C-alpha cells in the first residue's frame, strides 16, 4: 500500500506524489486524515509540476508563514492547475531557482490545492511587507528584481585598504573574497561579485583590486579567498583559496565548504551559556555547509549558534537523551526548556524551527520531568520523529502553546526514545495528543491545526456538563430564566451506576448545546445539600422544566435505559410541540393543495421508533419555524392517507417544497433522523 506506490511509511506528500505520478492508495495517503486511520489499521503536464525540481519548495498553508518569515529572501510563485500562464512559466521558474541556489529561496504555492491560502509572483523577507513582482517572466529579469532586494556590500580596495582589511580580518573573524583585475584580462563581473556578496552576506567580505592602480600589490601573484589571518606573503599564502572561475555559484560553493564550523563549547562553557540565553546547539560525537548561514540570520532573534562535542563530556548528552548527532534550540532556562529539530536539515526549516520554538512554550519531556501526579492541566504530544504527520503537528502545537501560556503546560514526548513511557500511556499511533486534567485524560481526534486543538482545549475548560455547586445550582438552575430548562445528574464517585452514567451524560450534553442546559452535582462533596434536595439513590436524573402555571419543580427520570439517546429523547420530550396533527382532509388541503413548505412525520402510536423520534421531530419543527411548517400523520388512525403517500413503515419523514413558479408541491423522503441534519438538508434545498 505504501510499498504498492513503492515508498516508505516515512514518505512526504511530495514523494507520494512523485511516485504516484507514474490510484486508490494515493487518495488515501495524500489526504492527511485518511492516512491517519490507515497507519494503524493531464498527469504529464498539470500534476505535481514542481515535485521533481528539488530547489523549489512547494508550500502549504500551515507552514507558509513560518517558512517565508524564517529569514532568507523568498520568491514565491502562486499558480493554478489549468492556467497555461502557470504552464508557460514552469520551465523558467526551474531554471531561475537553479540559477539562484545559495542566494534566495524559491517557492511554489498551488492555489488549486488551497485557494484559502490565496498566476502571481511575490517577494518575502522577515520584517518587511510582501512585494508583488510585475515585470516580464524571464530569468534575467527575475534575477535583477531579486537582486534589488538583496543586501550586498562590495568594497573597492586600494593597496592601503587591502593590507588593512587583511590585518584586521582575524580580530573580526570575517575573511575576504577578493578579485584582482588588470586589463587584457578577465575577472569577476560587477553583477557576479554583487551576487557573491549577497550569497555570502554576513559570512565573507567581498572586494576587488584594480591591478593597474595597485601595481606592486598585484605582482605578489584571478579571485582569492583569504581566511581571517591569511595574507599573500610566503608565510600565509598556503591557506589562501586561489580560484579562476567567473561563476558566482561555483565560487560560492568553494567558499561555503571552506568556512569554519560553529564555535565549539566545552561542558563548562555550555552550562554557563544555557542558563539564561537562547542557543541553537549542534550536538555531535567527534551537514549542509549552508547551515553556516544560521549565525547571520538568527542574529535579530538573539539566538546564538554553537556546537558541542558529546564525546568530550557524554553525561551532558546522555542526560538529554541525545544518542545521535542532533540539533537543539534552548530558550533561556538551562536544560529545562529546549526542543530538538526533527526532519531534513535544511536552512529555512531550521530557521523557522528555531524562531518558532524560542517564541513558544513547548517542553521536551522525559521520564523525570514527565508531569506524573501533576493535576494541573497538561497537553502532551506522543510522537515519533520519523512520522510525517508527527512532524507537521509540532509547529501547530507551538502556535497553540503561545495562546495557552499560564493556562496549561505543553510538552512533547519522543516515543522512539521513551518507548516504555509511551507503552504505559497506551499510545497506539503517532502522533497522539492528550490533555491531562484532574485525574482525567482526554485524547484529541481532530485535524492537526492550532485552531482545532484550541477549540478542543476550550471545550474541556468549559464542558457541556456544567459541574455545579449548591450556590451555582441556586443561581443557575433554581433561578433559571423562564424559557430555560435543565437536566441535572446527582451522583457520587463511589456509585457504580453513577460511574456508568457519566460518559453517557457527557455525550448527551454535547448533543444538547443551545437546547437544554446540562449539569451535575457531586453528592459526595455536597452531602448535606443533596440531602436538602431529597436525593435518595445514586445516580438521580432530574429535569427542571420551563417555568409556567404547572406545579412541578422537576421530573425524575425513572426509565430503564440510561444511555445518551434515551436521555436526550426524554429531555427533548418536555419541550413544546411545534408541529400540528393533520387529518386526511387537513393533510390534503394544507400540504398537498397548499402554498408552503412542509415536513411531515408519518407515524404510528404503537411504534417504539415512532415514539423515540417524536421529541426529535418537535425539535426540527421548532428549529425551522418561520421557513417550513411541520405536520404529523397518524397512519393507524388514517392508513388510507399513509398508503397514498407511499409510507411503508414508521416513522417516515417527507419534505414538501412549494415552487411558486409552477404552482406545485415537490415530494421527497428524508432518511436522516437527526433534527440538525434534516434542517440543513432542508435549508440547502430551499434556495435551489
Curated annotation (Swiss-Prot):
Disruption phenotype: Mice are viable and healthy but show enhanced endoplasmic reticulum stress response in the salivary gland.
GO biological process: ERAD pathway; intrinsic apoptotic signaling pathway in response to endoplasmic reticulum stress; protein folding in endoplasmic reticulum; response to endoplasmic reticulum stress
CDD domains: DnaJ, PDI_a_ERdj5_C, PDI_a_ERdj5_N
Domain Thioredoxin: 55-149, 361-460, 464-572, 578-683
Localisation per UniProt entry: Endoplasmic reticulum lumen
Glycosylated position list: 437
Subunit structure comment from the entry: Interacts with HSPA5 (via its J domain). Interacts with EDEM1.
Function: Endoplasmic reticulum disulfide reductase involved both in the correct folding of proteins and degradation of misfolded proteins. Required for efficient folding of proteins in the endoplasmic reticulum by catalyzing the removal of non-native disulfide bonds formed during the folding of proteins, such as LDLR. Also involved in endoplasmic reticulum-associated degradation (ERAD) by reducing incorrect disulfide bonds in misfolded glycoproteins recognized by EDEM1.
Name of the protein described by the UniProt record: DnaJ homolog subfamily C member 10
Organism in which the protein naturally occurs: Mus musculus
